[PDB]
Design a protein around this nucleic acid. Structure first.
Ligand SMILES: [K+]
Ligand SMILES: [K+]
Ligand SMILES: [K+]
Ligand SMILES: [K+]
Ligand SMILES: [K+]
Ligand SMILES: [K+]
Ligand SMILES: [K+]
Ligand SMILES: [K+]
Ligand SMILES: [K+]
Ligand SMILES: [K+]
Ligand SMILES: [K+]
Ligand SMILES: [K+]
Ligand SMILES: [K+]
Ligand SMILES: [K+]
Ligand SMILES: [K+]
Ligand SMILES: [K+]
Ligand SMILES: [K+]
Ligand SMILES: [K+]
Ligand SMILES: [K+]
Ligand SMILES: [K+]
Ligand SMILES: [K+]
Ligand SMILES: [K+]
Ligand SMILES: [K+]
Ligand SMILES: [K+]
Ligand SMILES: [K+]
Ligand SMILES: [K+]
Ligand SMILES: [K+]
Ligand SMILES: [K+]
Ligand SMILES: [K+]
Ligand SMILES: [Mg+2]
Ligand SMILES: [Mg+2]
Ligand SMILES: [Mg+2]
Ligand SMILES: [Mg+2]
Ligand SMILES: [Mg+2]
Ligand SMILES: [Mg+2]
Ligand SMILES: [Mg+2]
Ligand SMILES: [Mg+2]
Ligand SMILES: [Mg+2]
Ligand SMILES: [Mg+2]
Ligand SMILES: [Mg+2]
Ligand SMILES: [Mg+2]
Ligand SMILES: [Mg+2]
Ligand SMILES: [Mg+2]
Ligand SMILES: [Mg+2]
Ligand SMILES: [Mg+2]
Ligand SMILES: [Mg+2]
Ligand SMILES: [Mg+2]
Ligand SMILES: [Mg+2]
Ligand SMILES: [Mg+2]
Ligand SMILES: [Mg+2]
Ligand SMILES: [Mg+2]
Ligand SMILES: [Mg+2]
Ligand SMILES: [Mg+2]
Ligand SMILES: [Mg+2]
Ligand SMILES: [Mg+2]
Ligand SMILES: [Mg+2]
Ligand SMILES: [Mg+2]
Ligand SMILES: [Mg+2]
Ligand SMILES: [Mg+2]
Ligand SMILES: [Mg+2]
Ligand SMILES: [Mg+2]
Ligand SMILES: [Mg+2]
Ligand SMILES: [Mg+2]
Ligand SMILES: [Mg+2]
Ligand SMILES: [Mg+2]
Ligand SMILES: [Mg+2]
Ligand SMILES: [Mg+2]
Ligand SMILES: [Mg+2]
Ligand SMILES: [Mg+2]
Ligand SMILES: [Mg+2]
Ligand SMILES: [Mg+2]
Ligand SMILES: [Mg+2]
Ligand SMILES: [Mg+2]
Ligand SMILES: [Mg+2]
Ligand SMILES: [Mg+2]
Ligand SMILES: [Mg+2]
Ligand SMILES: [Mg+2]
Ligand SMILES: [Mg+2]
Ligand SMILES: [Mg+2]
Ligand SMILES: [Mg+2]
Ligand SMILES: [Mg+2]
Ligand SMILES: [Mg+2]
Ligand SMILES: [Mg+2]
Ligand SMILES: [Mg+2]
Ligand SMILES: [Mg+2]
Ligand SMILES: [Mg+2]
Ligand SMILES: [Mg+2]
Ligand SMILES: [Mg+2]
Ligand SMILES: [Mg+2]
Ligand SMILES: [Mg+2]
Ligand SMILES: [Mg+2]
Ligand SMILES: [Mg+2]
Ligand SMILES: [Mg+2]
Ligand SMILES: [Mg+2]
Ligand SMILES: [Mg+2]
Ligand SMILES: [Mg+2]
Ligand SMILES: [Mg+2]
Ligand SMILES: [Mg+2]
Ligand SMILES: [Mg+2]
Ligand SMILES: [Mg+2]
Lengths: 271, 46
RNA sequence: CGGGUAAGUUCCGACCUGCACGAAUGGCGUAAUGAUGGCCAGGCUGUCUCCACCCGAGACUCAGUGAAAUUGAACUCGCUGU
RNA sequence: GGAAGACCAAGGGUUCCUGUCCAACGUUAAUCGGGGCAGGGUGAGUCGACCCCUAAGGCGAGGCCGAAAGGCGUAGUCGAUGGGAAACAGGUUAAUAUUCCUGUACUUGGUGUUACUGCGAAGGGGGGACGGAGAAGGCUAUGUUGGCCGGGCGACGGUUGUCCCGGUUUAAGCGUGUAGGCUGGUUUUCCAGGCAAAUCCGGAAAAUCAAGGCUGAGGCGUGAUGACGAGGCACUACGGUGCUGAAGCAACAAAUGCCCUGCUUCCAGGAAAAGCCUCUAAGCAUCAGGUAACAUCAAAUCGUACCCCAAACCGACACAGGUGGUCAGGUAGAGAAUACCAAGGCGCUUGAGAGAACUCGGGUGAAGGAACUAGGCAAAAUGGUGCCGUAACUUCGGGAGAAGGCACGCUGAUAUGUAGGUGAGGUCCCUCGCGGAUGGAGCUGAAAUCAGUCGAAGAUACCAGCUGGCUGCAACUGUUUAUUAAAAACACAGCACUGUGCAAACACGAAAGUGGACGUAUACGGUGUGACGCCUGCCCGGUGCCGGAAGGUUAAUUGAUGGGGUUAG
RNA sequence: CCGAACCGACUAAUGUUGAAAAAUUAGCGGAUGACUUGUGGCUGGGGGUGAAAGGCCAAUCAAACCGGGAGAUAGCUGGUU
RNA sequence: CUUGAGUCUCGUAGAGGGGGGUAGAAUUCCAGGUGUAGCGGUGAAAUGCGUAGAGAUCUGGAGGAAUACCGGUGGCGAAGG
């Protein structure tokens, strides 16, 4: 549910929380945990290569099954859990043979539900099939781009993909961006939408709430000196130039896609 | 007031010690230079 | 122009003749917050009228130790002129 | 005296102790010294390092990449600031001591017996193993008072008592298993999981019992017929040694320490690997190996002095500076504030006089009270607890400690000490205990009311908000020009535009790669704006961006055609 | 929210051949957080890092330090027995 | 007391309400085929669209909204509907 905080202090007045009473309150499933230490946005030259990253809360990595290739064996949802690594929630599922795995939690999935993968799985939310076996027009998520590679599209909270057509070895998908994209029909997809759609309704409310998430402050280029940024300089607030990135490329409409290798799969760009 | 030299022997040896000098060709040229000058103490290594 | 003062180039409220405001290089408001800018009042006082006395640490004298910047050379006054 | 005491890490390196010397060093003198010279001093199976194990990160056989130098990285191998066995009390030196001595312990390993016996890993599983905040209960450290024991009878009125002073200490280990915390137990059968196997873990189905296990502070017992112990006595080379030794209990208060890696709750969702336990594979078969008891041997090496909020470290100085961790007594107090003290440590390495101006740091001030000044700068002032009471405005939380006001010491009574807390003997019960119930002796003890009483003054010292009215700017908490700027600047939650379909855009990089992200459009980057409320109008001619692609123009490339040089003729 | 430790640095006086090449004293702000701190690691000079002041990168910063090209060049100033 | 008011039994008509699904027509857009100089609009025009191939015509796709005929001074609802 979406809950406004009461304004008992200035840093709380605008906070809006997403509170889900169904998420597990205890610890995660340890055999599927890994450590995952932070980067500060720095690569192996030790240089900052993505600005505005650092700090935030310590986080363990949950191994999530994006391939969904344990075919023919049913699993039951044991519990939903918070995952710090992503916007979606995850579900711990127990297979009939006694194996446990984490999956992205689809909308509507709850403890006790049954799921299955494979060519013969039923058309139900949480089931995974090759898109060859999914009716045209369906809503799916966690879509593979190459067969067997694992889900890569529509994984964020509340996202989904529409199967709009099927021609030969390929299906045409409408992505969340609005792009129409061809993908091999042997690629798998999970029925339904990714859950936790209220994610986008939260309001951080204060500066520190962004710092808790590992985001460091953004300094506007127009607030700098010319040596630092093309926008810098001026006696007072001055601008007088076409907006650019810190490295000089136009940043208000100039397109940057240049991938002739994958152009053949884009039926229609998002705009 | 806190001054610039705050000694630590581990940091001294890791930063400037004999084995650190031997690890790169530029560090071995430091040692070659100091041997040619005839320094009595080649490095910080105690 | 009005208010506040005995008296107000500041302040507050207006007027519009905007040298040269104006709508996300945002416009107009806004409770709360501020070692933030301006203005007024009560209390308070050596801030002041106008300073007095006192207690300590130096300054001063004696003994011991013992610097510094500077320095062409000096037998190194005023005035009016040059 | 929450240090200017005690003790570590770091850093230093003989500064430590003793004798001797006073040139230089010491801001003076120096017989003294962290100074000179000489001698002495650091004792470990248990403390630390080394060691086993890993984090960030480093290096890295082959490998991939790069003119060369080199870059990245796999298998690996390093790397603590983290995980991993075990010792305490007393005594002793001029100087070391959990290291020496006395007493009493514990751990790991090698051997060898004996008894019994499926052992076996580079593999599987378990465990190790983990956040923030908050709330209590049970405790101990520790303190206070009484009792006890020893001593005292007071330089000046009184002091044989409801008087004064001191002491009243004891460990690890071993045994016991309590307040509390967690979890149902046991036995069969079966199985697409745990790269193979598995009796282990996971899963399924039955039967049966309902209490079984795990964890755990403290207490109690033992350790201890010991040790220590106020003092006494005897010697001193008057520094100190030698000898002996009483009581050695209870109640109450009580941590920020322990139970507690608990419990409750929240979202921002909280290392790793080994030691350890367990399972089997290859293999081994009356062998090896395993388990237990007993014996015996081993536990090396390096550090250990001394300073450590400092005269020994970082600051050129015996420099108002800087420096992480641990300990935490009394009275008042909410307190680790503050005042006065304890243990303990110090008076800061020039002194002696004098009592001018002027400077510095403070005290008080007649009448006036901001007239001072750029400006109330500075100063003065306010200041506690309980109760009464409190406006506009407001995002309904605030504003608010608004403002303003009253009470406050001591003595007696209520009540020879109350409400409350604590809780003995006794008594009863028991599935007999570290038990339940009853009962309340003793101990501790607010707050209030009534009456009285002293002073100019009872929050008496230290300590400890000045308040209100109008307005600009920024929503707010934050950040910044180390060393003249803390702000209205930066950031910020929120908003919008825009890029990005994943081998993402983008960034570091001749490259390999790496970050973005073990993320996937409810995501990620860039840009502007800057909570919230009401809103955000017109202009696409210019510059940019986006789309279009018929025509004009146009590169390398191609080399038609024309012209020339040469000369067989 | 009030307030010590701890982290800061708004005002004033002193100091300015300082006790100190940035402090002392009286007041001042934060004080469960975008907090603070120990140990170790990583980023390198047209480069880093920057809640952005051209701030900081060893008392050095509109391009660190050290060595080299190097006796750069100096239509300028000084000096020239 | 049973005549007002209500309960039960059986049936009837209804665009009464809430939720979900689906169908066909049409508009627009996208792609392609044929085809060529106009289309569109008005009182008349112009802006606009079109030789970069529109309009027209055929095929395929995407998507949203509304439900022709039935349909009625017909029905249902407290009103809004
Ligand atoms: K999450
Ligand atoms: K910003
Ligand atoms: K600018
Ligand atoms: K810079
Ligand atoms: K500017
Ligand atoms: K400027
Ligand atoms: K270093
Ligand atoms: K702008
Ligand atoms: K606004
Ligand atoms: K301020
Ligand atoms: K103001
Ligand atoms: K001196
Ligand atoms: K007496
Ligand atoms: K020692
Ligand atoms: K005191
Ligand atoms: K005198
Ligand atoms: K009582
Ligand atoms: K106060
Ligand atoms: K505003
Ligand atoms: K400030
Ligand atoms: K700033
Ligand atoms: K508002
Ligand atoms: K608001
Ligand atoms: K324009
Ligand atoms: K334009
Ligand atoms: K930390
Ligand atoms: K330097
Ligand atoms: K440079
Ligand atoms: K009906
Ligand atoms: Mg960013
Ligand atoms: Mg994340
Ligand atoms: Mg932003
Ligand atoms: Mg600037
Ligand atoms: Mg530029
Ligand atoms: Mg301007
Ligand atoms: Mg302009
Ligand atoms: Mg006027
Ligand atoms: Mg006036
Ligand atoms: Mg005005
Ligand atoms: Mg403007
Ligand atoms: Mg303008
Ligand atoms: Mg506009
Ligand atoms: Mg504009
Ligand atoms: Mg604008
Ligand atoms: Mg603004
Ligand atoms: Mg010496
Ligand atoms: Mg000595
Ligand atoms: Mg001596
Ligand atoms: Mg002397
Ligand atoms: Mg002499
Ligand atoms: Mg000496
Ligand atoms: Mg000596
Ligand atoms: Mg390498
Ligand atoms: Mg090699
Ligand atoms: Mg490694
Ligand atoms: Mg190792
Ligand atoms: Mg360590
Ligand atoms: Mg000693
Ligand atoms: Mg005790
Ligand atoms: Mg007497
Ligand atoms: Mg005992
Ligand atoms: Mg014991
Ligand atoms: Mg505490
Ligand atoms: Mg010692
Ligand atoms: Mg001294
Ligand atoms: Mg000092
Ligand atoms: Mg400190
Ligand atoms: Mg105390
Ligand atoms: Mg104190
Ligand atoms: Mg005098
Ligand atoms: Mg005087
Ligand atoms: Mg004075
Ligand atoms: Mg005074
Ligand atoms: Mg006066
Ligand atoms: Mg008087
Ligand atoms: Mg007076
Ligand atoms: Mg007055
Ligand atoms: Mg005046
Ligand atoms: Mg005047
Ligand atoms: Mg003042
Ligand atoms: Mg004062
Ligand atoms: Mg108060
Ligand atoms: Mg008690
Ligand atoms: Mg103004
Ligand atoms: Mg602000
Ligand atoms: Mg602030
Ligand atoms: Mg400054
Ligand atoms: Mg300042
Ligand atoms: Mg990649
Ligand atoms: Mg702005
Ligand atoms: Mg600062
Ligand atoms: Mg201060
Ligand atoms: Mg505050
Ligand atoms: Mg505070
Ligand atoms: Mg260089
Ligand atoms: Mg500037
Ligand atoms: Mg510097
Ligand atoms: Mg340059
Ligand atoms: Mg040259
Ligand atoms: Mg020269």
């Amino acid at each position: 549910a979406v809950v406004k905080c009461k304004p008992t202090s200035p840093g709380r007045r605008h906070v809006v929380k997403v509170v889900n009473p169904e998420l597990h309150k205890g610890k995660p499933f340890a055999p599927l945990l890994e450590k995952n230490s932070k980067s500060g946005g720095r690569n192996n030259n030790g240089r900052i290569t993505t600005r505005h990253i650092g700090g935030g809360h310590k986080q363990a990595y949950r191994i999530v099954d994006f391939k969904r290739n344990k075919d023919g064996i049913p699993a039951v949802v044991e519990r939903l859990e918070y995952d710090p690594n992503r916007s979606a929630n995850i579900a711990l599922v127990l297979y009939k043979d006694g194996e446990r795995r984490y999956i992205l939690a689809p909308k509507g999935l709850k403890a006790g539900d049954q799921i299955q993968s494979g060519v013969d799985a039923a058309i139900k939310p949480g089931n995974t099939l090759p898109m060859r076996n999914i009716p045209v027009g369906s809503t799916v998520h966690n879509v593979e781009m190459k067969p067997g590679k694992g889900g890569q599209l529509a994984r964020s909270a509340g996202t989904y993909v529409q199967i709009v057509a099927r021609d030969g070895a390929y299906v045409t998908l409408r992505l969340r961006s609005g792009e129409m994209r061809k993908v091999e029909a042997d690629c798998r997809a999970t029925l339904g939408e990714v859950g936790n759609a209220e994610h986008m309704l939260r309001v951080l409310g204060k500066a520190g709430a962004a710092r808790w998430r590992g985001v460091r402050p953004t300094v506007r280029g127009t607030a700098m000196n010319p040596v630092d940024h093309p926008h810098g300089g001026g006696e007072g607030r001055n601008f007088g130039k076409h907006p650019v990135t810190p490295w000089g490329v136009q940043t208000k409409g100039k397109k940057t896609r240049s991938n002739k290798r994958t152009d053949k799969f884009i039926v229609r760009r998002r705009s | 007031m806190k001054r610039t030299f705050q000694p630590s022997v581990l940091k001294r040896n890791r930063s400037h010690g004999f084995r650190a000098r031997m690890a790169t060709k530029n560090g071995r040229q430091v040692l070659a230079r100091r041997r040619a000058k005839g320094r009595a103490r080649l490095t910080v290594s105690k």
